[PDB]
Amino acid sequence: FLPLYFGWFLTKKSSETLRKAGQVFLEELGNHKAFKKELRHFISLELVSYFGKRPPGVLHCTTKLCDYGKAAGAEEYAQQEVVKRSYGKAFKLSISALFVTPKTAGAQVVLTDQELQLWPSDLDKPSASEGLPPGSRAHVTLGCAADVQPVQTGLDLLDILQQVKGGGEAVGELPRGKLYSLGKGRWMLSLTKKMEVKAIFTGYYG
């Protein structure tokens, strides 16, 4: 049978680098003037505590949830030649931004053309994936609220990218880049220089 999901799994070193950057962002954003004004638009605050649910091991960037072939389009994805050829191969993922919402905290991944070939295109695509290019959903989950599932992180990103498509000015300056307030508890850090993490494409089993 198929794996739980296919994706890029960061090396232990790359995972640690991205994770430590994630927590620093939560600490910074939480201490920031701009954030403390819109708390009512966020909570009815230590964000590291708020996003208590975090990946226990190495971080990953999912491509296709298969659920052992229970998910729609799972078989059609795994039978691809590019998926078989890329299985076990090493890749580099570009991290363009770190973001936060009342539900999730994650990192936006900007996929290369090669890596975009490993991105699925099934019949079911959520509303927020409308006028945006494929792979825009690509991300690494850094944390979630207590009653939120990791899958939500992708939806949060697509919702965020829809906002920026309309454009915005930054409300602050973090050491790694400019901070943008997108309203309704959403925040994005546009990194001055994009982070590169090393990862391996493969399948995860429960």
Residue numbers in the entry: 164 to 207, 215 to 337, 340 to 378
From the article:
2′,3′-cyclic nucleotide 3′-phosphodiesterase (CNPase) comprises 4% of total myelin protein in the central nervous system (CNS), being the most abundant CNS non-compact myelin protein4. CNPase consists of an N-terminal polynucleotide kinase-like domain10, a catalytic phosphodiesterase domain11, and a membrane-anchored C-terminal tail, which contains a cysteine residue that undergoes isoprenylation. The catalytic domain enables the rapid hydrolysis of nucleoside 2′,3′-cyclic phosphates to nucleoside 2′-phosphates. The CNPase catalytic site, lying in a groove between two lobes, has pseudo two-fold symmetry and contains two apposing His-X-Thr-X (X denotes a hydrophobic residue) motifs, characteristic for 2H phosphoesterases 113537.
While recognizing the caveat that the high KM for these mutants makes kcat rather inaccurate, this implies that the π-π stacking between Phe235 and the nucleotide base is not only required for substrate affinity, but it also may define correct substrate docking into a productive binding mode. In the F235L structure, the flexible active site β5-α7 loop (amino acids 319 – 321) is in the closed conformation. This loop is often found in a mixed conformation, and its conformation depends on the reaction step. As the active site of dCNPcat is empty in the crystal structure, we determined an additional structure of CNPcat with no ligand bound; this was successful when using the F235L mutant. Our observations allow us to speculate on active-site dynamics that take place during and after catalysis: The β5-α7 loop in both dCNPcat and F235L is closed, confirming the closed state of the active site in the apo form.
